[PDB]
Design a protein around this ligand. Sequence first.
Ligand SMILES: CC(C)n1cnc(S(N)(=O)=O)c1
Length: 93
Amino acid sequence: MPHAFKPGDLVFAKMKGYPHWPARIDDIADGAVKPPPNKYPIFFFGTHETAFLGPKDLFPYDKSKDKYGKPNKRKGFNEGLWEIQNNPHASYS
Ligand SMILES: CC(C)n1cnc(S(N)(=O)=O)c1
């Protein structure tokens, strides 16, 4: 059975006006800005941008990759595909 989301989990993350996007649940660094209650820090591969999302917008990567893991014209999306598949746990700093 599934657990709750935890840092390091891989997802496609959905934001308004964007296709479901390769992403991970991040850790919160000591001293770093925390997300709102019930929100997770989502790091988007390719763009390397962060947003705060709740589970309604988070699709586990293994289940979803056949549906959402195909090339996209959007800026950074194809780069993000490579990262989630090839080095999803790297520092992209
Ligand atoms: C805040 C806004 C500019 N945005 C955050 N993440 C993306 S994305 N999913 O990486 O295309 C866009």
